[PDB]
């Protein structure tokens, strides 16, 4: 069971900021890490897969990176429609595991 603990547990920022959420994995997931956005009351939306690749239709604001076992999600310019809970996932093994979340709020 690979454990992913992403920080901070909650983030507070305004528009135009560089909002960064980092994910830390206990084991060595190769690069199979994806990021999801969940506005409350709606299904999660896939944003970045393979830890660095932007999914089709997602705005170019978001970005992903990887230096070792820790992965980063960066929003270059926050916008009012990017205020939701962000999750981190690994699919290195067939037993997928999620992060605990990060609520970007005004």
């Amino acid at each position: 069971d690979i454990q992913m603990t992403q920080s901070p547990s909650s983030l507070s920022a305004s528009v135009g900021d560089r909002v960064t959420i980092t994910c830390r994995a206990s084991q060595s997931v190769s690069s199979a890490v994806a990021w999801y956005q969940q506005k409350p009351g709606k299904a999660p939306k896939l944003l970045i897969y393979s830890a660095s690749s932007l999914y089709s239709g997602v705005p170019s604001r978001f970005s992903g990176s990887r230096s070792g076992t820790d992965f980063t999600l960066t929003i270059s310019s926050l916008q009012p429609e990017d205020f939701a809970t962000y999750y981190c996932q690994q699919s290195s093994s067939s037993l997928i595991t999620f992060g605990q979340g990060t609520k970007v709020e005004i």
């Binding site: 084991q27 190769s30 690069s31 070792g68 076992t69 290195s92």
Partner: protein, 335 residues
């Protein structure tokens, strides 16, 4: 004759895991004699000898099981590439296990040997610590189909666990590739170059280990000797495919680290320019100053060195004047 070659002399133990269609027997022993009667039992048994520095035990089992004396040399010769040898009564396979320490980026090899004799398999290890815990759990807990199958399936299960541990090794090497890539791109240092050399050596060792393993698996499934049996061929083909994956990954990583080395390596001879620019500017600034200081510190007893207008601060200001002139002359050539 038949002297151990490796550097391990501490761990020694003998282990037998006799599993049946509906029964199971397991024990650990320290005497070679107690495991001998398991040769003739119908149900498959797994016999493990984790210390081969005790030569006498290896001779005893080799003589009891009637294996040729030639295989004993390879059993005790740890520094050897993987290989497979097909004989009338048994098949002799040489394999290897790897352990990677992330704190100290070094790769350690441990040889293992497998001999399939009809209704049993023998394993010889240099020390304690095996990658075959999952197959032990599968045997003990009646999960999977290893309990319903014969000893050829045991040889399969052990090799499958081996290649799975190879995958586990490749994950950590992947992490090292990533970290070293970003260091080399944005943080050029001596430590990064030393780490890159270590990683290149480790990948060369991996290549020389994995290609013979692929040939061993190919021989195992294509030739299918009588002991392999017809039903177990697709499983050996699956492990051959896994070895193909491992080899392709190794070649990709080796190419990546060579490409990492090349850019820094040719970036040399521009460090020479910087070093010489620094040396030239420092020498040009401080050599004439020392020369004039020695001249005006030179004593002759007939010099016009009387103070007149106080001249020590004047000469120091002159030193500053030529120093500033030299610095201004520099950065004109954008040095």
């Amino acid at each position: 004759t038949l002297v151990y070659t490796g550097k391990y002399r501490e761990d020694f133990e003998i282990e037998v895991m006799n599993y049946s269609i509906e029964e199971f027997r397991e024990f650990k022993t320290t005497d070679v004699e107690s495991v001998l009667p398991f040769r003739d039992s119908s149900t498959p048994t797994w016999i493990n000898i984790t210390g081969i520095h005790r030569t006498d035990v290896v001779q005893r089992v080799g003589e009891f099981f009637g294996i040729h004396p030639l295989v004993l040399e390879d059993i005790l010769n740890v520094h050897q590439r993987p290989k497979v040898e097909f004989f009338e009564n048994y098949v002799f396979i040489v394999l290897k296990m790897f352990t990677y320490d992330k704190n100290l980026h070094e790769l350690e090899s441990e040889q293992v040997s497998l001999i399939l004799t009809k209704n049993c398999v023998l394993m010889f290890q240099e020390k304690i610590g095996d990658v075959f815990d999952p197959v032990r759990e599968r045997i003990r807990y009646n999960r999977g189909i290893i309990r319903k199958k014969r000893a050829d399936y045991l040889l399969y299960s052990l090799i499958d666990a081996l290649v799975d541990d190879y995958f586990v090794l490749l994950e950590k090497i992947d992490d090292e590739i990533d970290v070293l890539e970003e260091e080399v791109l944005e943080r050029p240092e001596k430590e990064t170059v030393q780490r890159t050399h270590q990683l290149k050596r480790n990948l060369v060792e991996l290549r020389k280990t994995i290609w013979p393993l692929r040939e061993v698996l190919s021989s195992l499934y294509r030739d299918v000797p009588p002991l392999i049996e017809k039903e177990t061929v697709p499983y050996f083909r699956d492990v051959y495919d896994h070895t193909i994956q491992i080899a392709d990954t190794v070649e990709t990583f080796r190419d990546i680290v060579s490409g990492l080395l090349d850019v820094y390596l040719s970036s040399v001879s521009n460090k020479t320019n910087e070093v010489m620019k620094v040396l030239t500017i420092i020498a040009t600034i401080f050599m004439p100053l020392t020369f004039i200081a020695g001249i005006y510190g030179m004593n002759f007893e007939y010099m016009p060195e009387l103070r007149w207008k106080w001249g020590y601060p004047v000469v120091l200001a002159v030193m500053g004047v030529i120093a500033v002139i030299m610095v201004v002359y520099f950065k004109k050539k954008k040095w």
